[PDB]
Design a binder for these strands. Structure first.
Length: 200
RNA sequence: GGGGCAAGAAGACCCUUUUGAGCUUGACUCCAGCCCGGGCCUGUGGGGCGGGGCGGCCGGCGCAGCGCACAGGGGAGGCCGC
């Protein structure tokens, strides 16, 4: 049950991995959970709660975004969205997670903001005075029709004790989401990006 | 032998009764009988198939695109010269 020993090995295999390593300990850690007593047809589905967010925002949010290092955009490609509809698929893939503006809600809501979600991207509302900076820090369950759920503990090189806190939070939450409870999950795995999986 | 509505015989016809019986069925509720399955009786052996668990490995076409994309993640570089 103790996941600490398997986490302790993670640093050891990291030695030969190398990798792209953006704010990663030479890789990204993952939690892969198998499932039992559940199928896509029935409905106890629940959606609940380096890394990046697309700052589709306005003045000040843009100024902090260049200073932080996040891409910032407004009406330039808003109108160009009318010119190309593939443009909304191109920019949704361009940013794994997105970040809308509360002030700039007006322009995207009337336009391609739900179009962004047609490909599958909904940006997160941000007034510039509210800290776009601390929203990054804020950054889940998704049974839907997927029986097998894999999430990333993160490109975390942070202490293994923090790593085990997140390995636990997801796990108690997954059971809280599963009607049987902790006995609806067949397997729990912890692994490096190109490295092998280790159990709980 | 006309009458004594002469005598038998608490009409056996037909009604009534929360009164019966015999028979019937595809009435309601059932019982023997029988058929069927498993347990017990009930020993001493030899096999074979299938499930579950494990456990290797192999696969999967609307073409749009680059081709059969099984999917959930990681992932821009690893370790394929990819």
């Amino acid at each position: 049950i103790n996941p600490e020993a398997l986490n302790k090995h993670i640093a050891e295999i990291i030695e030969r991995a190398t990798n792209e390593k953006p704010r990663k300990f030479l890789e990204t850690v993952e939690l892969q959970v198998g499932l039992k007593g559940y199928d896509p047809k029935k409905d106890p589905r629940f959606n609940l709660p380096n890394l990046k967010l697309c700052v589709i925002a306005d003045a000040r949010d843009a100024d902090r975004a260049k200073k932080l290092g996040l891409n910032y955009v407004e009406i330039e490609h808003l109108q160009q969205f009318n010119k190309d509809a593939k443009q909304i698929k191109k920019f949704a893939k361009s940013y794994d997670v997105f970040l809308a503006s509360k002030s700039l809600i007006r322009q995207i809501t009337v336009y391609a903001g739900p179009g962004f979600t047609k490909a599958g991207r909904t940006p997160l509302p941000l007034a510039p005075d509210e800290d776009l900076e601390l929203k990054v820090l804020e950054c889940k369950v998704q049974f839907k029709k997927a029986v097998g759920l894999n999430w990333p503990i993160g490109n975390v090189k942070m202490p293994a004790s923090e790593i085990a806190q997140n390995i636990m939070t997801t796990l108690n939450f997954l059971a809280t989401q599963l009607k049987k409870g902790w006995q609806n999950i067949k397997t729990v795995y912890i692994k490096s990006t190109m490295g092998p999986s280790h159990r709980i």
